[PDB]
Amino acid sequence: QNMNNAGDKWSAFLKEQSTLAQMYPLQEIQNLTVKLQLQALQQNGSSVLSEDKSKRLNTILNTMSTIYSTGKVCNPDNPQECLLLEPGLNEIMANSLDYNERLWAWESWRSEVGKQLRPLYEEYVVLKNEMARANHYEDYGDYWRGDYEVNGVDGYDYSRGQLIEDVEHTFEEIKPLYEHLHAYVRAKLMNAYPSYISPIGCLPAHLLGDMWGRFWTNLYSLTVPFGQKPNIDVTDAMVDQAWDAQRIFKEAEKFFVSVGLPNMTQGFWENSMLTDPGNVQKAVCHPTAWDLGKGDFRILMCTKVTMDDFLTAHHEMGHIQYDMAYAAQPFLLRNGANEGFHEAVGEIMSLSAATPKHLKSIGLLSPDFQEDNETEINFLLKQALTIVGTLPFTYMLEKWRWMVFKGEIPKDQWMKKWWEMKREIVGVVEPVPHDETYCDPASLFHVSNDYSFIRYYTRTLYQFQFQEALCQAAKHEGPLHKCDISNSTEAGQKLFNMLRLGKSEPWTLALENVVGAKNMNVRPLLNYFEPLFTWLKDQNKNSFVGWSTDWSPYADQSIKVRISLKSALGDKAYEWNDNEMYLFRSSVAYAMRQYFLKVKNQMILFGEEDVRVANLKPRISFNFFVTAPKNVSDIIPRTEVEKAIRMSRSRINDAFRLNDNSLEFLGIQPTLGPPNQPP
Amino acid sequence: FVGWSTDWSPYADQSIKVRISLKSALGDKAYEWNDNEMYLFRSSVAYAMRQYFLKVKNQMILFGEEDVRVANLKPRISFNFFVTAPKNVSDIIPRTEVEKAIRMSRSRINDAFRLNDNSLEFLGIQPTLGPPNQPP
Amino acid sequence: STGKVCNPDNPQECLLLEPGLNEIMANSLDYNERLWAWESWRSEVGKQLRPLYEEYVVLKNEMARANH
Amino acid sequence: INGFDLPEGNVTQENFVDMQQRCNASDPAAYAQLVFQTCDINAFLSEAVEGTGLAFIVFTEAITKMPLSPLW
Numbered sequence: 042q043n044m045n046n047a048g049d050k051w052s053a054f055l056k057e058q059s060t061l062a063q064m065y066p067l068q069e070i071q072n073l074t075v076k077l078q079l080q081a082l083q084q085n086g087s088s089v090l091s092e093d094k095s096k097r098l099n100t101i102l103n104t105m106s107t108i109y110s111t112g113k114v115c116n117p118d119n120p121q122e123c124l125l126l127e128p129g130l131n132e133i134m135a136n137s138l139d140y141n142e143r144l145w146a147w148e149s150w151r152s153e154v155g156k157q158l159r160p161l162y163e164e165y166v167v168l169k170n171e172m173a174r175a176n177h178y179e180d181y182g183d184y185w186r187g188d189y190e191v192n193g194v195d196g197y198d199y200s201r202g203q204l205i206e207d208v209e210h211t212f213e214e215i216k217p218l219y220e221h222l223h224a225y226v227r228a229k230l231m232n233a234y235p236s237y238i239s240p241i242g243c244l245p246a247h248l249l250g251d252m253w254g255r256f257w258t259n260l261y262s263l264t265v266p267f268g269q270k271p272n273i274d275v276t277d278a279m280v281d282q283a284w285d286a287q288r289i290f291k292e293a294e295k296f297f298v299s300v301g302l303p304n305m306t307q308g309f310w311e312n313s314m315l316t317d318p319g320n321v322q323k324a325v326c327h328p329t330a331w332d333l334g335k336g337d338f339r340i341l342m343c344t345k346v347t348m349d350d351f352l353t354a355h356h357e358m359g360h361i362q363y364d365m366a367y368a369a370q371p372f373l374l375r376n377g378a379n380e381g382f383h384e385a386v387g388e389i390m391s392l393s394a395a396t397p398k399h400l401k402s403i404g405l406l407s408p409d410f411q412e413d414n415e416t417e418i419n420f421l422l423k424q425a426l427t428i429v430g431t432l433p434f435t436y437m438l439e440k441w442r443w444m445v446f447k448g449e450i451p452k453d454q455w456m457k458k459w460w461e462m463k464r465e466i467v468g469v470v471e472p473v474p475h476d477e478t479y480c481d482p483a484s485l486f487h488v489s490n491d492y493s494f495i496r497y498y499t500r501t502l503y504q505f506q507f508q509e510a511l512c513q514a515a516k517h518e519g520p521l522h523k524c525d526i527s528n529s530t531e532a533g534q535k536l537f538n539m540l541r542l543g544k545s546e547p548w549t550l551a552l553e554n555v556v557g558a559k560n561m562n563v564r565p566l567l568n569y570f571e572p573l574f575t576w577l578k579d580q581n582k583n584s585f586v587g588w589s590t591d592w593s594p595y596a597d598q599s600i601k602v603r604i605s606l607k608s609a610l611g612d613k614a615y616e617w618n619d620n621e622m623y624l625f626r627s628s629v630a631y632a633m634r635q636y637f638l639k640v641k642n643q644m645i646l647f648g649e650e651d652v653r654v655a656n657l658k659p660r661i662s663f664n665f666f667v668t669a670p671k672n673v674s675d676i677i678p679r680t681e682v683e684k685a686i687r688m689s690r691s692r693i694n695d696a697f698r699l700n701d702n703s704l705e706f707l708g709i710q711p712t713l714g715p716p717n718q719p720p
Numbered sequence: 721f722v723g724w725s726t727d728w729s730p731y732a733d734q735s736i737k738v739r740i741s742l743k744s745a746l747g748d749k750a751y752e753w754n755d756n757e758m759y760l761f762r763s764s765v766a767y768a769m770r771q772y773f774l775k776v777k778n779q780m781i782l783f784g785e786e787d788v789r790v791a792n793l794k795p796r797i798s799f800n801f802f803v804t805a806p807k808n809v810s811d812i813i814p815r816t817e818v819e820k821a822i823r824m825s826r827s828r829i830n831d832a833f834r835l836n837d838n839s840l841e842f843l844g845i846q847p848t849l850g851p852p853n854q855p856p
Numbered sequence: 857s858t859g860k861v862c863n864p865d866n867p868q869e870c871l872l873l874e875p876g877l878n879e880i881m882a883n884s885l886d887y888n889e890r891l892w893a894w895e896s897w898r899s900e901v902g903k904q905l906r907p908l909y910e911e912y913v914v915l916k917n918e919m920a921r922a923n924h
Numbered sequence: 925i926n927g928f929d930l931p932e933g934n935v936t937q938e939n940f941v942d943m944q945q946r947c948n949a950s951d952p953a954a955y956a957q958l959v960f961q962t963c964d965i966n967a968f969l970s971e972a973v974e975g976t977g978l979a980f981i982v983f984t985e986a987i988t989k990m991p992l993s994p995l996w
């Protein structure tokens with residue numbers, strides 16, 4: 042309650058100055074700096090809507106956010122134990138090697154949250170497009186691309202539609218590298234899951250290391266190149282020299298003063314809270330960097346003596362040194378130059394500190410250490426599962442959301458176009474077919490909590506453009522992944538000339554101060570991974586590189602049905618809506634009940650939700666397969682469904698008035714009927 | 721009135737009685753009525769309620785077989801049923817709207833069981849039309 | 857003792873027998889809310905306790921017939 | 925209509941030559957394995973009508989497509 046009233050006095054003050062800012066016109070201004078401050082304050086954003094539509098939008102955003110954080114999943118063998126997303130469902134997807142338990146956690150969660158977020162997400166697209174078109178954008182996707190826009194600074198301009206071509210032009214140069222990584226992981230996953238993965242097909246969506254396949258970083262224990270070499274870990278050398286909580290930051294401050302950057306501000310050491318306190322003190326323990334204002338910079342984290350938090354100390358100090366540099370600009374220009382620069386400057390501090398060249402000079406590695414070429418492959422493949430493995434996921438998701446907002450995908454094809462783009466761009470196939478009652482994008486955090494996702498694509502490309510430009514200034518000689526910018530001064534002067542700009546200059550002007558180009562480039566990212574790309578092309582000499590978008594993990598127990606309505610009845614035949622598909626799924630579930638009772642002597646309660654229909658066409662054709670009533674992993678074999686349909690084919694024909702030539706089960710033929718009578 | 725009647729129910733004024741005569745329609749060749757046939761009957765009624773609300777009331781309502789509540793199953797093959805909104809257990813569809821839904825799809829329910837409107841009787845619903853002629 | 861009942865308008869709020877489901881049945885005057893709490897609870901717990909209770913009758917009759 | 929999954933009320937004798945060109949412009953690989961029979965009249969009006977092959981093969985095939993076929 043002390044921060045909600047003090048938080049609302051800041052928000053009520055800003056809308057009062059925002060409605061004062063439209064007193065000044067915007068095109069009668071000449072100075073570029075005072076124009077940039079005026080446009081960032083004049084921005085209407087919401088409030089352009091009707092006041093009853095504005096409260097409907099905030100009700101949807103609160104409902105979608107609390108469904109994602111309060112979802113219970115029930116274990117079909119004990120309905121008294123519900124697992125909720127972050128504790129328990131994320132641990133199954135990150136640690137299990139059981140095919141049937143990973144397939145259960147994927148499906149369940151998906152389906153449930155899916156359905157909910159569906160109607161809500163559908164109402165969310167209409168209200169967000171109204172708010173964007175009242176602010177003179179064409180849709181809400183064009184509103185998100187307004188961060189990268191640059192207007193009239195003599196040669197540094199950038200259009201909001203130009204971002205779409207630069208993402209797709211840079212992506213088709215990563216596809217050679219991603220195809221060889223996709224082929225190597227597929228060959229290593231066939232040893233972990235035999236009889237489940239095709240050697241020329243896509244990867245199943247529930248075997249990728251987490252709930253959505255965003256990062257492949259949990260596949261390292263199955264895909265490690267040389268498992269008899271320990272990946273270098275300096276955590277024991279920290280607890281053997283009695284390093285306190287303070288040594289990890291004091292060695293971090295000596296890294297930044299080594300390159301020619303200022304010290305910490307000396308208010309940094311009292312006000313900050315570098316560990317959780319000596320009290321058992323309830324205090325959100327999450328690494329972060331605060332910029333309260335008035336030259337007061339604090340870091341909040343709960344650091345343990347590990348090389349993990351030795352590295353994120355270098356990451357979180359990088360946010361501080363970026364913040365201390367642009368503190369001389371006016372107040373409305375104290376951000377990063379775009380949304381992607383702020384995280385990218387933090388991660389080139391972490392790459393330079395994790396090298397074994399830096400660790401043996403900072404006192405943490407035996408001066409008699411030998412780096413072999415087998416351990417550099419182990420290190421580079423662990424990087425590519427996080428860096429390269431997330432780039433087709435990020436590109437596909439923002440491409441789907443951009444086409445939904447402008448209307449290239451109507452709402453009857455949201456889940457049809459989503460899974461076609463998974464097979465084609467990412468190379469990932471779903472294990473169970475999903476119709477237009479699911480909403481699988483909205484089961485991710487950034488989609489249901491209203492966040493932009495293209496900042497994770499551009500940050501990955503800026504990160505290696507910065508690192509390659511700084512290592513030419515530090516006079517590096519070897520590969521790019523061995524580089525360290527310690528003890529230099531000329532590299533820091535190359536870095537400091539960008540850090541102090543803020544938002545006062547266009548971001549394309551900020552890139553030439555470091556890299557020497559006006560656009561994002563993918564060639565520094567590929568130079569980092571050329572020792573891996575050379576080794577990967579030799580491991581895929583007998584493999585197949587690429588994938589087929591036709592294979593599915595369910596499409597060998599499926600039966601194709603073809604229906605010819607106008608041949609059987611003609612001018613008098615009903616039309617095939619989705620109420621006829623409901624009656625077809627109940628007739629097949631009835632035929633499976635009669636087969637298991639009269640032949641196998643069991644009673645099994647098949648329903649219409651256990652018949653899974655895929656690939657519905659206009660000629661009236663689809664595939665279907667039958668599943669055990671609540672075990673989603675148990676598919677009834679194709680030979681037992683053919684025997685069940687043969688037993689009750691005369692009953693299914695009568696429910697639709699068809700005659701075995703207008704209702705074809707492809708692969709099942711009519712057999713009997715000997716003729717005669719004359720004795 | 722002191723005492724009570726064991727015949728009244730809070731649902732038995734929106735129920736429809738169904739009578740099925742299998743051996744009259746087919747005779748020596750008729751299937752036997754197990755509880756898999758009761759599952760197919762509850763899906764055919766849920767299909768007929770879906771088609772009535774779509775083509776007359778312009779709404780899409782997802783009726784299932786669990787929204788058709790069957791009581792008083794006898795050997796002659798007779799029971800009562802009433803229809804309920806899909807998850808609102810307190811919302812009973814009125815008897816006049818289920819009679820209009822069954823009249824719309826009676827020819828489709830008969831074909832699923834091979835009955836002919838004298839072997840599948842909905843008590844209170846009668847066949848009406850059919851004027852004869854042709855000689856001009 | 858561990859049964860959750862879901863309100864068909866918000867599946868994110870489950871009520872468990874002694875706090876919440878006993879208060880509806882003892883205080884409400886709404887016909888449609890008392891009819892919901894009765895049915896739901898019933899049906900669910902019902903089904904579970906069914907197979908178990910059926911297996912319970914056979915084992916308890918064996919123990920009683922061995923004690924004459 | 926079975927190799928490309930079209931509805932039945934769109935492909936008929938008036939536009940068969942129109943839409944078969946639309947199928948090789950859409951899927952040039954899936955159109956290659958399909959077969960198309962070449963048949964036109966004056967090839968069915970000129971056949972083996974050899975001796976004892978008209979009253980027994982030509983007439984008795986056409987009688988079975990009239991109603992009351994044992995009478996004819």
Ligand SMILES: *[C@@H]1O[C@H](CO)[C@@H](O[C@@H]2O[C@H](CO)[C@@H](O)[C@H](O)[C@H]2NC(C)=O)[C@H](O)[C@H]1NC(C)=O
Binds near residue numbers: 072074075
């Ligand atoms: C308007 O633009 C001018 C230059 O285009 C800015 O002028 C500079 O102002 C700072 C302090 O305000 C001086 O130290 C510089 O010497 C000035 N530069 C020149 C070339 O004279 C001016 O600051 C801009 N207006 C605002 C409000 O920032």
Ligand SMILES: *[C@@H]1O[C@H](CO)[C@@H](O[C@@H]2O[C@H](CO)[C@@H](O)[C@H](O)[C@H]2NC(C)=O)[C@H](O)[C@H]1NC(C)=O
Binds near residue numbers: 083085
């Ligand atoms: C903020 O919203 C206002 C509307 O409340 C937008 O404004 C108007 O500007 C037009 C000229 O283009 C005037 O004719 C109207 O009088 C203004 N609004 C009214 C009726 O008061 C304004 O364009 C929006 N600003 C932004 C950020 O685009």
Ligand SMILES: *[C@@H]1O[C@H](CO)[C@@H](O[C@@H]2O[C@H](CO)[C@@H](O)[C@H](O)[C@H]2NC(C)=O)[C@H](O)[C@H]1NC(C)=O
Binds near residue numbers: 414415418576
């Ligand atoms: C690491 O370096 C060693 C030393 O060159 C490599 O061993 C050579 O491998 C090639 C190809 O198999 C052979 O033709 C050479 O004869 C090997 N050298 C010796 C001295 O035996 C090794 O392949 C490298 N490993 C990686 C992963 O690059």
Ligand SMILES: *[C@@H]1O[C@H](CO)[C@@H](O[C@@H]2O[C@H](CO)[C@@H](O)[C@H](O)[C@H]2NC(C)=O)[C@H](O)[C@H]1NC(C)=O
Binds near residue numbers: 299402527528
């Ligand atoms: C990079 O910077 C470090 C830190 O100043 C230098 O480390 C010193 O190295 C000398 C000899 O190698 C030692 O006598 C000092 O004790 C080290 N200083 C500290 C603080 O540990 C290192 O030499 C520098 N690298 C180069 C090439 O000059």
Ligand SMILES: *[C@@H]1O[C@H](CO)[C@@H](O[C@@H]2O[C@H](CO)[C@@H](O)[C@H](O)[C@H]2NC(C)=O)[C@H](O)[C@H]1NC(C)=O
Binds near residue numbers: 672675676
């Ligand atoms: C769901 O079905 C799967 C089979 O598709 C079951 O997995 C079997 O589990 C038993 C023991 O748990 C193993 O001996 C089998 O080898 C498994 N089969 C396969 C194909 O892996 C699973 O147990 C079923 N779940 C439930 C709750 O019945």
Ligand SMILES: *[C@@H]1O[C@H](CO)[C@@H](O[C@@H]2O[C@H](CO)[C@@H](O)[C@H](O)[C@H]2NC(C)=O)[C@H](O)[C@H]1NC(C)=O
Binds near residue numbers: 810811888
């Ligand atoms: C379930 O159906 C009942 C009706 O059988 C609904 O009760 C109605 O509720 C509205 C407002 O809540 C009242 O104006 C009506 O008078 C009620 N009808 C009766 C007969 O009492 C109930 O709202 C429905 N529940 C849901 C979740 O839709």
Ligand SMILES: *[C@@H]1O[C@H](CO)[C@@H](O)[C@H](O)[C@H]1NC(C)=O
Binds near residue numbers: 298303
């Ligand atoms: C930074 O602080 C150290 C001592 O903490 C001091 O020796 C050094 O001179 C400082 N850096 C500068 C540029 O003054």
Ligand SMILES: *[C@@H]1O[C@H](CO)[C@@H](O)[C@H](O)[C@H]1NC(C)=O
Binds near residue numbers: 933934935
């Ligand atoms: C069949 O479909 C095509 C494409 O929708 C259409 O152009 C054509 O007219 C249709 N044929 C009919 C309606 O006979």
Ligand SMILES: *[C@@H]1O[C@H](CO)[C@@H](O)[C@H](O)[C@H]1NC(C)=O
Binds near residue numbers: 948949952
């Ligand atoms: C498709 O086949 C026809 C002949 O049937 C041919 O004329 C045409 O050029 C083919 N089209 C393509 C794209 O190969």
Ligand SMILES: [Zn+2]
Binds near residue numbers: 356360384387
């Ligand atoms: Zn960060």
